[PDB]
């Protein structure tokens, strides 16, 4: 094994990195990592880019809940267990898409838009928290408010050092589990002491009070980190770079020509530049010939090819910043350069793949837990009823009464004939399903029946010619 | 010419904390300046003969006392610095070989290892003298002197001397079982442990008689070990005696360069094993450590860089430590001249 | 052992402690014999005639 | 500069000194200077 040697002649030797835990290569530079991180994506166009992409196509532009509680370990019936499911996710589109905003306290934002910040944050932070809360001076029906922590809010207390039950902010038991977070306030305007405040992960009866959601990667991970670690020097080395040759283009191309000569500066610019005597501004009209006695010269300089190069090797930088932050090659450079169809169809599904990863992982987990923390008040409130003769109640089994999926846009197709031509001929063969069909393009299958049964009984009444799904 | 490094061992002093661990259980931190702890004598009157019509001499309630005690404060540290890392360390062999920064984490480690060992040795010795003899002080260069005194009575602690010692009458036709007999008569409670040290037992097992303790059909129940049973060890729990065990410790503590024993050459501890025994620890007393919030705790750790022109990593543990006994008359202390 | 301190002033530092090396070095041996055929011509001692 | 702070009102800062002992301190700094845009919009008699 050369690889754990000194190497091939020697070159190595140098490289012997010390053998740490993630925590403890994480912890110490936290802070430094995630400025970094968002200095870079507040100031630089492909990483803006790159987040944008993240939001726009893991979760999309609406974000719906899907409700199949399971019935057959609960021994309700199906039509009970239907109609439990029509009633509160109708309660749920009338909670989470109101206009006010009410769902969560600044008054800010929609579900949806919380779910897409939620996905940014565990972009360019590496994690995201969610705070569950309630006020009793709301007059309105549910009550349960929600609120996004900003990561750089939770530290530890005192900005003490880091023990062996709290480690950034993050309480931690015998085992890896964590109990409460400590969030800081802090106050832009003027500063203020400081004051930090504890807030237990679950009440004691079990409610989800602080959502923490991340993708850990070792035995213990406190706090995850983002996903820019790989990438962060060379896009920063690159805007560098970027910088510094436009600058150079900018001032090798500004001097244009050259006077030599041995009389004063001002009789010199006059009679060979043909500037008017009454430095001397030159009229830039018209063809000069200039007279030149044999000490004089006139010299027209010439600048190098001003992308000598440079656009090949910001390929192979920005193909390096596309395999690390996940984004294929084409849509975080915009480059879209020639190809045939089998290349833009790999490249897609390769996208495609991490992204529909990201959201069943992250997104959907911030959600479901979201949607568990309402029903209960909900259930308990009494604004919907539980089915009778039930093994269980809500408490002794949540994920039982709420197990539950979210759809969200789709893949629009680069040729969507050739795409509706295969669910048609899937349709026609038993392979799958209406469901499954009408979920790749984000639609419920229920509310499609709905509307063409109202449809075609629209059709009839008005006279029109019988559609095509109408029952002979 | 290049070498290797096959072997590389470790020295070790006998050191294992036996009387900390058989008579000082249920440790007991607390947040406080001063403990106290308290007794009450006891001692009721036989009634006296009166006459029906005399009527008088009312008695007195009884009442205790209370004793009050201050812990004394302990702080090792050691240090690294860049200069020691550069050349070698004799650990590490002279093929493979590894980065400075690998050699920082070798001395820091072995650092803690001898501070935890020097605290270690702090308490087992401040539980040893707490038996011998009643009272003992904690004093020092830097430590301002400071003693806690139970009130052990003076009939305890009993000394040979030119009567009665075991050394100066014959080794047969004696039995030493009268002896102890005699002094365990002053301890109050039952006593269930012996502990001699090397020479004491020597002393104590070359006895005729007590050969004939062992060896008889129904003259006893005891069972011992005469011959060798533990030689690298620093306890020896050899049979019981009738009903005491026997046990023989010989532990060493190094105070300067040299070596020294625990039990002061022979002596013999008449005790028992529930003895009501008190292991308190005070508050610690660092900024940072009350800023973490912790207070009342043993073994604080901590370490900083002192921004100096040759840095240096430094470390520290503190606990400050004070070992008590309720029942100062539970044990009697035997010289063994 | 670990002499008290006095919770104000500062302790001393205490040194460190490094080991001590020796060095050796092997030594070689080699037995040696040899046949050839004018013994094997013979019968050896504990070959039945 | 290590936090980003310039022209604040009151900041204050606790920090505690690695030193071989330890103490903690907590201060606060200002620059307070009151102006008047006007200075004559006022008249101050002594009375008697």
Redesign the interface.
């Known amino acids: 094994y050369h690889g754990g040697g000194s190497g091939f002649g020697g070159q190595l030797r140098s490289w012997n990195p010390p053998s740490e835990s993630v925590d403890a290569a994480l912890l110490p530079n936290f802070t430094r990592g995630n400025a970094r991180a968002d200095d870079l994506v507040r100031n630089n166009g492909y990483a803006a880019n790159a987040i944008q992409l993240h939001q726009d196509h893991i979760v999309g532009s609406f974000f719906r809940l899907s409700h199949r509680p399971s019935w057959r370990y609960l021994g309700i019936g199906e039509e009970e267990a239907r109609a439990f499911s029509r009633e509160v996710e109708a309660a749920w589109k009338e909670f989470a898409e109101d206009d006010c905003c009410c769902i969560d306290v600044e008054r800010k934002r929609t579900f949806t838009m919380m779910i897409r910040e939620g996905v940014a944050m565990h972009a360019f932070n590496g994690e995201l928290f969610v705070q569950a809360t309630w006020d009793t001076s709301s007059s309105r029906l549910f009550r349960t408010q929600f609120r996004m922590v900003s990561p750089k809010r939770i530290s530890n207390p005192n900005n003490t050092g880091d023990s062996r039950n709290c480690r950034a902010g993050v309480q931690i038991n015998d085992s890896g589990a964590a109990l409460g977070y400590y969030v800081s306030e802090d106050g832009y305007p003027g500063w203020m002491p400081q004051k930090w405040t504890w807030i237990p992960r679950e009440l004691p009866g079990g409610r989800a009070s602080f959502i923490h959601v991340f993708e850990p990667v070792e035995d213990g991970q406190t706090r995850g980190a983002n996903v820019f670690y790989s990438v962060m020097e060379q896009m920063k080395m690159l805007d560098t770079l970027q910088n510094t040759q436009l600058q150079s283009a900018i001032v090798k191309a500004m001097y244009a020509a050259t006077i030599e000569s041995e009389l004063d500066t001002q009789s010199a610019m006059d009679f060979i530049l043909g500037a008017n005597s009454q430095a001397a501004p030159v009229r830039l009209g018209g063809a000069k010939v200039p007279h030149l006695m044999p000490g004089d010269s006139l010299n027209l300089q010439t600048a190098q090819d001003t992308d000598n190069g440079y656009s090949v090797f910001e390929q192979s930088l920005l193909r390096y910043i596309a395999a690390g932050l996940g984004v294929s090659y084409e849509q975080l450079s915009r480059n879209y350069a020639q190809m045939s169809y089998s290349t833009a169809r790999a490249s897609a599904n390769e996208s495609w793949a991490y992204f529909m990863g990201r959201r069943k992982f992250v997104a959907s987990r911030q959600a479901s837990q979201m949607f568990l923390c309402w029903l209960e008040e909900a259930i308990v409130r009494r604004v919907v009823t539980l089915p009778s003769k039930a093994r269980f109640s809500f408490q002794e089994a949540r994920s039982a009464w709420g197990n539950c999926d979210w759809i969200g846009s789709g893949r629009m197709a680069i040729d969507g004939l050739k795409e509706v031509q295969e669910a048609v001929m899937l349709i026609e063969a038993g392979l799958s399903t209406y469901e499954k069909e009408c979920a790749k393009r984000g639609d419920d299958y229920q509310e499609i029946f709905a509307q063409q049964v109202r449809e075609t009984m629209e059709r009839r009444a008005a006279g029109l010619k019988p559609p095509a799904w109408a029952a002979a | 010419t290049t070498?290797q490094?096959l072997a590389?061992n470790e020295q070790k002093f006998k050191f294992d904390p036996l009387f900390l661990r058989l008579f000082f259980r249920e440790s007991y931190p607390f947040t406080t300046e001063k403990v106290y702890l308290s007794q009450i004598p006891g001692l009721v009157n036989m009634a006296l003969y009166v006459s029906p019509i005399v009527s008088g001499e009312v008695i007195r309630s009884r009442g205790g006392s209370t004793s009050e005690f201050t812990p004394?404060?302990?702080?090792?540290?050691?240090?690294?610095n860049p200069q020691?890392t550069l050349r070698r360390?004799?650990?590490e062999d002279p093929q493979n070989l590894?980065?400075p920064?690998?050699r920082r984490?070798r001395?820091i480690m072995?650092?803690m290892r001898?501070?935890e060992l020097?605290?270690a040795?702090?308490e087992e010795?401040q539980a040893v003298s707490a038996v011998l003899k009643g009272k003992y002080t904690?004093?020092?260069?830097?430590?301002?002197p400071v003693e806690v005194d139970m009130g052990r009575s003076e009939e305890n602690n009993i000394t040979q001397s030119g009567g009665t010692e075991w050394s100066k009458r014959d080794k047969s036709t004696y039995d030493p079982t009268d002896d102890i007999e005699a002094y365990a008569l002053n301890a109050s409670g039952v006593v269930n442990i012996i502990v001699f040290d090397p020479k004491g037992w020597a002393l104590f097992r070359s006895f005729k008689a007590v050969k004939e303790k062992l060896d008889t059909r129904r003259g006893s129940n005891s069972e011992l070990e005469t011959a060798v049973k533990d030689l690298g060890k620093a306890v020896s729990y050899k049979g019981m005696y009738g009903d005491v065990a026997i046990v023989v410790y010989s532990g060493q503590?190094?105070?300067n360069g040299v070596k020294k024993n625990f039990l002061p050459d022979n002596t013999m501890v008449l005790g028992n094993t529930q003895a009501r025994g008190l292991r308190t620890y005070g508050c610690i007393?660092?900024?940072?450590?009350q800023?973490?919030?912790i207070n009342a705790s043993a073994r604080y750790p901590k370490n900083?860089?002192?921004?100096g022109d040759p840095a240096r990593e430094?470390t520290?543990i503190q606990s400050?430590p004070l070992m008590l006994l309720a029942d100062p008359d539970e044990f009697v202390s035997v010289q063994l001249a």
């Open positions: 070498a490094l590389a004394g404060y302990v702080k090792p540290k050691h240090e690294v020691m360390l004799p650990d590894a980065d920064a690998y984490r001395i072995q650092n001898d501070e020097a605290i040795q702090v010795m904690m004093t020092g260069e830097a430590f301002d503590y190094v105070e007393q660092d900024a940072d450590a800023r973490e919030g900083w860089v002192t921004t430094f520290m400050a």
